[PDB]
Amino acid sequence: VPRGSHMDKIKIGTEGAYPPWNSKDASGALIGFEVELAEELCKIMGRECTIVEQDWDGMIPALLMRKFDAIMAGMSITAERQKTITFSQGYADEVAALAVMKGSSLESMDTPEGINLTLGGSAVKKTLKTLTAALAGKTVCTQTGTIHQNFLESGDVGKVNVRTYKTQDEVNLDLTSGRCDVALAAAVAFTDYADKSGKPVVLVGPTFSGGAFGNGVGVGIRQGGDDAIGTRDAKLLKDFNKAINTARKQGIISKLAIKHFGFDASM
């Protein structure tokens, strides 16, 4: 199928530094849940697939610049991001959590197990008041250009002393070095790291969903338009959603999630 054709090859951008979503093997080849899912979705469509590496900070500009056609990199679906790109339906959930080292004063919290910032209400606002007091006078680290940064900078938990790094591996090491007091990231990121490193990282407070954390992880695609590029982009959105539905019906997304996360993180 020639490039530009109705049914041509799809280039998918991923980071390669975010296990178990996307990572690199010892040979440096890209692996993980999203690599295997991308391949399965493109097989359903009957289109060829190429996976290419892209740094997280530059991921959305790179899509806009046409370095690739789709983002599959653990990217949460948010209304903010929908201002400039669009998403497929979600294929997996990712709850966020605060993490500290064993010994921290935050290990004595009593919050709900989870809160949803879109559903909101008085009990959620009270939990945020508690978190505001818990973070006062502490340093908190997170990955640059994430929902986690957005939340912390929002004022919803007060005026936070935020530290950021380009990659989640740096966040993990800032926390375990003791150089930062608290970190915010996906719960699955902290458990993947706790599992590999053996370091005593502990989740504290409620898990976070909704609001600045969005609603699941989806395929990021350029917004449709009327020029050649734009009608191809509209069709890619249509094809991805059909393929996700088919994969879900066949039990594929669930099976893959268990094979990577150890539990069914799929949507």
Ligand SMILES: NC(=[NH2+])NCCC[C@H](N)C(=O)O
């Ligand atoms: N490849 C990565 N490092 N992704 C980080 C994603 C974190 C979060 N889900 C967000 O959309 O901001």
